[PDB]
Design a binder for this molecule. Structure first.
Ligand SMILES: Cc1cc2nc3c(=O)[nH]c(=O)nc-3n(C[C@H](O)[C@H](O)[C@H](O)COP(=O)(O)O)c2cc1C
Ligand code: F3S
Lengths: 1472, 81
């Protein structure tokens, strides 16, 4: 995986460009996925200029006359099996090219070599040919390219019209050519020997290799595409495609002409995200714009409200953000117009891109900084690319533009400054709207009758609404969701409960909305849509809102502004309509809105305020979905807006769904009415109504941002109308007819069930006299409310069975728990075999089954140390494995006690915060674990209250006592699949004995992610559910996030068995497992090991109080104080007996079925049936999607290999073979080697050897020293211990010093390099991630996210990037240069010193949790002096030596940044 | 290769019809293309009447209520990748 570009600055073609492109492709094999075949790849491509002399000599050889103007060449993929489809394709191409007047010179078969392609990639290899077309009409070059594009599009359409498969056009232009295929990167010049010619010379080249997630190669899906090259993935494609379908119906340009009609479906079918983005890029470029302008308009910069950018750039960004929706997501782009060559990044800057300028007028950019060898005496400047940055080369003029110069050159074409002033705001209009026209608040009886019609209980206003208005943040729960699903319920559940949210697994990183909030915008625009190919002032004349939600006053003001151009539509249906009133009402409204939008109305407001005792209200979600889809299908949505007035919106999950469906603005008046009625009774205290409304709106906005950030979307404009949800319990036809793009694996109720439910609730609310709202049970168990999975009697009998140690009451427990009506999906399944039963004594023993049960991880911050220790001792007694969770563990428990009880844990976790990971913590386990997302709160980092962090947890996590700790949602290490592969390689290098486990959360599409992670050399997968426990998390993420684990288990099993990969990994599940029947069913679905979790907590004393976040648990399970910890009564024998009875029961079940071992049942889905709940519910749940049985073939249905999947050995092997006296006698050693970018994790296995032999601090500093000369690979010196000293001459790629644990790293340029050390990048992104001790001295500038999660390390660098020093915890960082935006964000401990000469720190710093001042204490001057002296001594710098020279006048230029929580905890106060 | 049909003149649905159809299919291999791997055929098919009782008992086992008129069934080939 990797994209890169090479360009000659002056613009003269030369062979060295293509030679260096091939050389760069030959050195990327380490990032890709190796295969046992040795021939199978997943795609590679190069893109160069047309060698005119080559094809001219070809034409001369044929016998024709060489033309004068430039020749054109097209490369086509034809079908190979049949010999008649080729003739049809050739006939179509020839009749379409000759329809314009150009002269065809002939076809040519490209010489290839099929001996090197694998077997599977050879079964779908197309027939590659080229067609040579010349220009005889004497037309200019630009019109030639336009005609070629139009011809290619019409050819594509015509070939589609005849339904011919396996046909593609790689390129058709007189400027460039593309060679791409499904081979290995290094075998490119062997498959296409044409590139070995001496006449292929160009002035630019682009190269790409990808990383696929499956094993089915499709040749037309390889990159680069026509005029683009993409690395990463795009998060917003389902929303951008629909908005394209809306923008198509008004775009037109005089350049194309009539042929515009032949260009309407711009994005075809069967393309990837990059393919659609490329098609849009090309259709926008061919209309007059340039590559920089299109890059700015498609993936714009983050419009920051700061004074660090001139206002011309601000006007430009405003225009580009107003004209088109951004295409967000991790994206490194290397694109090329016919004239410009551009390389750019996305908004957040998640992928790396580094370039190099040589003295030969040659620029080389890519993902790694050492792919092409270059003598260090011939470079001019090295650099990098931050977020939103871009670098361009103009070949026609022969010039190179960096970021700022290109911005200033682009901000001169059009006067956007006088254009942006056409916009108007709403705050001004609300201000000029004087306070008249206050309408009377509805009656208390009216309010109660309207709230009862929707099923709002009183706890929905006492528990989840009070905090929103009181503080401004949502509520917090502390336990999983044990309530039945919506369709299986019997009470009135709103329609918004059927929709589960989304999140991003290893494929995409979530965004931290608390720290990286400067790149999130909630702007809304009314009157925005228009022609996307025009340049005028009418495109920026519109109305702008600062948020999608509105109050009553703002809505009234907007309505007065709109006036008579808005059309209101009823959304109510008669209660006396009949059996089909709802469908008729839907058709009526969807016809009325279409008839109204055609009649000049530009604004549609969908009201339902006419709800009375005779007309029931249509569920707002259904109405807005129907209307938006009908307007999209009618080519009308581009004309108007869509505003919704609802009487249900109370929570933050409602507005999220309403905006995701397609609504523009949403107005909720019943909520404000209830807030006013509760304030007038004196419940909020002394706060006015306006302050309460402001707090409520702020809470809604923050909740919307949090829900949007779980996926990776940073803008609301691209998220609106994308369908970013999953429906569970809705029929396939309904969601396919009314909702844009959502999947429903299992069908559900149609419209009749919904109509019945709504009519029942309306009748109950309006036909009887209501006196008050019911108590209701949804978050707490009530006798009148819903049923729960954990009731009182069940916990009581479980504790009795576990304590008294008798199997009979345990059988009674199992009967009572499996007698209740259906509550989960595994209740509808029915076990039915066909054999004869066998005795119970002959099945496998209990130990052989108890060795398959694992307890999941529970952090030491959530649980009390006594409970964690008790669990760890209980699980190590029978032979099973335990789990320590995040938050580290006590090192003193690394040894067995005198009693023979071992308090250690067999499974250590590697969270996203890296709170206790060191080199000794990762050598005390038998199996590691990578927690990507948790089962309860998916797409979010764990929480811990500020009072739960005692001094013990403080010293264990290397944190600040009495400060709230929130781990980042992403890992900052896993931004893509190859990053996950790199991390797995590192974990397998640091521990030569342990396995690596990846934990996932069940959702749709997990099959492809599981197929991709299996190729990353993982060997254990853990699929959690949506009903898993937690320590502290919001209630919305508990109730409205995730899916049942049955979906994930069945889908992952099927996908793995389909790709011939099931025999390599193991499967493990957890979530809601209580009995042996559930275990048998899960083993039948495909799992091999099982997790229990919360049940063990009940075996130790939990009584389901759900107050672990408050530190006041009565029994003493999840607490940190002493007087309640004393009340603990846990005992390991309880857990042992629980596991014993659990194995007994499954033994009974297996005996009753007729088998003798769990291995005979795994995968045998045919032993399950679906039984209906009867002929009275009429729920059409079809479970065949999870009952499909794919046949494996020859291989078994489970893992049939011993030991972990081995990995190739890096340089360290040789080191171990040389530094033998170090391990055998313990003496100093000095080694020298040569490093390359194809060698990863240099200095990691040696660290493990040293840790196992001596220890982390067993050797004096500098005991073994190593010297490397050359660009080092990735993860250099990860997890190094004290006594190891690496010294690099050159530069490092990325992740340098990750997880440092006492080592010492020094990076400096070579001695003969003509470079200013403080003006060139020398290290990559994510430096010192989660370090705990050591030092690091660099002689250049760092990348992005420098010194993230630092805890004890010391670092001195001559520069930094954006988001630097984020969420630091301890240590010292000296920065002798400039910093980026949002510096020192979330810092809660340590100290920093910035050397500012341009006096620009007050503009870049994030002054929220830290304070910056001047140095005034000699004690804090001596530290800096000694640190800089040591830096000079180590790296022999010249800038730092100069600073040390003129110390007297330079001490006055340093800013000292100190956290706020550490102002009264230091020994020497910073102040006088 | 070969085509054939079997019909009861009076209109009795009976088992011997399918019996003889399968027996006839089992006696055509001599005309077909003799192949090397022994498993790949060239195309075969049978066409019979819908056994209402089978599908009605199936739907009963699911839990629905079997209707009185004739049930209908459809056979579909869906994508596999
Ligand atoms: C009190 C508590 C603390 C937990 N802490 C963590 C944690 O720190 N990291 C993690 O990945 N999962 C954590 N989990 C979730 C468990 O790992 C597991 O997913 C969950 O307990 C399964 O739910 P179940 O017991 O219903 O099967 C925690 C769960 C509970 C109840
Ligand atoms: S629900 Fe939680 S607060 Fe204690 S009593 Fe049980 S661990």
């Amino acid at each position: 995986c990797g994209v890169g570009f090479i360009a000659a600055i002056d613009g003269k073609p030369r062979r060295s460009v293509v030679e260096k492109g091939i050389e760069a492709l030959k050195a990327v094999w380490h990032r890709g996925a190796v295969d046992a075949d040795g021939k199978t790849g997943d795609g590679a491509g190069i893109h160069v200029a047309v060698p005119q002399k080559f094809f001219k000599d070809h034409v001369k050889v044929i016998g024709h006359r060489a033309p004068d103007n430039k020749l054109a060449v097209g490369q086509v993929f034809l079908p190979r099996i049949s010999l008649d489809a080729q003739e049809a394709c050739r006939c179509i191409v020839e009749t379409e090219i000759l329809a314009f007047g150009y002269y065809i010179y002939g076809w040519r078969q490209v010489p290839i070599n099929v001996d090197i392609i694998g077997e599977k990639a050879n079964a779908t290899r197309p027939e590659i040919e080229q067609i040579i077309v010349g220009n005889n009409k004497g037309v200019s070059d630009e019109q030639f390219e336009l005609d070629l594009y139009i011809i290619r599009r019409r050819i594509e359409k015509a070939v589609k019209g005849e339904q011919i498969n396996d046909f593609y056009i790689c390129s058709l232009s007189a400027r460039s050519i593309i060679y791409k295929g499904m081979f290995l990167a290094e075998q490119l010049t062997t498959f296409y020997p044409d590139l070995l010619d001496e006449r292929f010379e160009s002035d630019f080249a682009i190269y790409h290799q990808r990383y696929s997630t499956n094993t089915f190669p499709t040749w037309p899906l390889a990159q680069p595409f026509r005029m683009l090259a993409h690395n990463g993935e795009i998060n917003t494609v389902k929303g951008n495609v629909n908005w394209m379908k809306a923008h198509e119906t008004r775009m037109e340009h005089p350049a194309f002409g009539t042929h515009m009609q032949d260009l309407k479906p711009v994005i075809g079918v069967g393309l990837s995200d990059s393919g659609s983005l490329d098609t849009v890029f090309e259709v926008m470029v061919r209309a007059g714009r340039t590559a920089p302008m299109v890059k700015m308009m498609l993936v714009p910069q983050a419009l920051t409200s700061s004074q660090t950018t001139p206002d011309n750039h601000k006007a430009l960004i405003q225009y580009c953000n107003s004209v088109m929706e951004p295409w967000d997501g991790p994206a490194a782009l290397a694109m090329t117009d016919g004239r410009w060559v551009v390389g750019g990044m996305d908004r957040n800057g998640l992928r790396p891109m580094r370039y190099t300028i040589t003295t030969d007028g040659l620029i080389i950019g890519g993902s790694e900084t050492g792919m092409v060898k270059i003598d260090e005496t011939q470079v001019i400047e090295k650099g990098r690319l931050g977020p939103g940055e871009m670098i361009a080369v103009d070949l026609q003029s022969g010039k190179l533009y960096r970021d700022r110069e290109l911005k200033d050159h682009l901000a001169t074409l059009k006067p956007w400054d006088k254009w942006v002033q056409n916009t108007t705001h709403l705050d001004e209009l609300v201000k000029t709207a004087s306070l008249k026209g206050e309408p009377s608040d509805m009656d208390k009886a009216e309010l109660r009758r309207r709230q009862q019609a929707f099923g709002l209980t009183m706890e929905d206003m006492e528990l989840i609404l009070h905090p929103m208005v009181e503080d401004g943040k949502e509520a917090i729960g502390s336990m999983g969701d044990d309530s039945p699903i919506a369709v299986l319920s019997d009470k009135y559940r709103g329609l918004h409960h059927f929709f589960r949210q989304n999140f991003s697994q290893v494929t995409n990183p979530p965004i931290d909305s608390l720290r990286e909030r400067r790149v999130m915008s909630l702007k809304t625009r009314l009157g925005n849509l228009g022609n996307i190919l025009d340049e005028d002032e009418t495109q920026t004349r519109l109305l702008q809102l600062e948020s999608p939600v509105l109050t009553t006053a703002e809505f009234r003001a907007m309505r007065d502004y709109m006036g008579d151009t808005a059309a209101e539509i009823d959304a109510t249906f008669p209660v006396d309509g009949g059996p089909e009133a709802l469908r008729d009402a839907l058709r009526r409204i969807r016809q009325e809105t279409e008839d109204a939008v055609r009649g000049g109305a530009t604004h549609v407001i969908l009201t339902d305020e006419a709800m009375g005792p005779a007309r029931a209200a249509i569920p707002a979600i259904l109405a807005t979905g129907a209307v938006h889809t009908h307007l999209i299908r009618s080519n009308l949505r581009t004309f108007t807006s869509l505003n919704v007035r609802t009487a249900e919106g109370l929570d933050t999950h409602y507005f999220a769904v309403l905006i995701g469906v397609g609504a523009t603005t949403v107005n909720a008046y019943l909520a404000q009415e209830a807030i006013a009625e509760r304030h007038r009774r004196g419940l909020f205290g002394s706060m006015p109504l306006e302050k309460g409304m402001a707090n409520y709106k702020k809470a809604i906005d923050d909740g919307l941002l949090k829900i949007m950030s779980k996926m990776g979307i940073s803008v609301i404009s691209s998220y609106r109308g994308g369908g970013n949800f999953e429906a569970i319990g809705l029929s396939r036809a309904l969601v396919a007819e009314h909702f844009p793009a959502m999947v429903s694996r299992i069908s559900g109720i149609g419209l009749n069930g919904i109509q019945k439910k709504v009519l029942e609730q309306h009748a109950t609310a309006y036909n009887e006299e209501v006196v008050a709202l019911p108590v209701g049970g949804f978050y707490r168990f009530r006798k009148s409310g819903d049923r729960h999975g954990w009731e009182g009697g069940v916990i009581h009998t479980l504790q009795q069975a576990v304590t008294n140690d008798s199997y009979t009451t345990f059988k009674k427990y199992s009967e009572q728990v499996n007698k209740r009506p259906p509550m989960q999906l595994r209740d509808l399944l029915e076990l039915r075999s066909t054999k004869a039963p066998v005795p119970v004594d002959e099945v496998e023993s209990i130990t052989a089954i108890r060795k398959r049960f694992i307890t999941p991880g529970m952090s030491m911050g959530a649980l009390s140390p006594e409970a964690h220790g008790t669990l760890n001792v209980a699980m190590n007694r029978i032979g099973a494995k335990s789990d320590s969770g995040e938050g580290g563990e006590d090192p003193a428990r690394f040894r067995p006690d005198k009693n023979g009880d071992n308090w250690n844990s067999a499974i250590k976790q590697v969270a996203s915060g890296r709170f206790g990971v060191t080199a000794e913590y990762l050598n005390q386990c038998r199996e590691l674990e990578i927690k990507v997302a948790q089962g309860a709160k998916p797409g979010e980092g764990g929480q811990l209250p500020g009072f739960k962090v005692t001094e013990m947890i403080a010293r264990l996590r290397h944190s600040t006592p009495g400060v709230m700790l929130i781990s980042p949602p992403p890992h900052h290490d896993i931004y893509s699949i190859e990053d996950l592969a790199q991390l797995i390689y590192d974990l397998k290098q640091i521990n030569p004995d342990a396995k690596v486990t990846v934990k996932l959360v069940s959702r749709s599409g997990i099959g492809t992610i599981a197929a991709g992670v299996a190729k990353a050399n993982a060997d254990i997968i853990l699929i959690s559910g949506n009903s898993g426990g937690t320590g502290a998390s919001p209630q919305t993420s508990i109730k409205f996030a995730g899916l049942p684990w049955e979906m994930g288990l069945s889908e992952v099993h099927q996908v793995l068995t389909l790709n011939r990969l099931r025999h390599r990994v193991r499967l493990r599940t957890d979530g809601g497992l209580k009995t042996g029947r559930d275990i048998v069913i899960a083993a039948m679905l495909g799992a091999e090991e099982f997790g229990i979790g919360t049940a063990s907590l009940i075996a130790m004393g939990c009584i389901m109080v759900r107050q672990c976040h408050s530190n006041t648990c009565p029994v003493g399970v999840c607490v940190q104080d002493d007087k309640l910890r004393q009340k603990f009564v846990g005992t390991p024998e309880k857990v042992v007996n629980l596991f014993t009875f659990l194995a007994e029961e499954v033994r009974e079940i297996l005996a009753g079925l007729g088998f003798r071992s769990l291995n005979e049942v795994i995968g045998r889905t045919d032993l399950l049936h679906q039984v209906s709940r009867g002929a009275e519910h009429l729920d059409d749940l079809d479970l065949n999607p999870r009952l499909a049985q794919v046949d494996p073939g020859e291989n078994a249905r489970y893992c049939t290999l011993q030991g972990r999947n081995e990995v190739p050995d890096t340089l360290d092997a040789r080191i171990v073979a040389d530094a033998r006296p170090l391990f055998e006698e313990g003496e100093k050693m000095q080694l020298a080697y040569n490093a390359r970018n194809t060698q990863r994790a240099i200095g990691t296995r040696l660290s493990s050897m040293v840790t196992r032999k001596f220890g982390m601090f067993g050797l004096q500093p500098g005991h073994i020293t190593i010297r490397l000369r050359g660009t080092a690979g990735q993860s250099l010196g990860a997890f190094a211990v004290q006594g190891i000293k690496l010294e690099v001459m050159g530069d490092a790629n990325d992740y340098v010093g990750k997880g440092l644990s006492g080592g010492t790293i020094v990076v400096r340029p070579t001695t003969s390099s003509p470079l200013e050390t403080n003006k060139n990048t020398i290290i990559g992104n994510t430096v010192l991630y989660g370090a705990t001790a050591g030092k690091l001295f660099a002689a250049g500038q760092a990348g992005e996210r420098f010194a993230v999660r630092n805890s004890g390390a010391t670092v001195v660098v001559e520069g930094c990037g954006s988001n630097g020093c984020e969420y630091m915890t301890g240590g010292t960082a000296v920065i002798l240069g400039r910093v980026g935006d949002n510096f020192a964000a979330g810092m809660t401990g340590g100290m920093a010193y910035v050397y500012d000469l341009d006096d620009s720190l007050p503009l870049y710093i994030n002054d929220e949790s830290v304070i910056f001042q001047r140095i005034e204490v000699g004690h804090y001057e001596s530290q800096l002096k000694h640190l800089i002296e040591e830096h000079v001594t180590e790296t022999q710098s010249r800038f730092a030596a100069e600073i040390l020279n003129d110390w007297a006048r330079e001490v006055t230029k340093f800013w000292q940044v100190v956290p706020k929580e550490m102002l009264n905890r230091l020994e020497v106060p910073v102040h006088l």
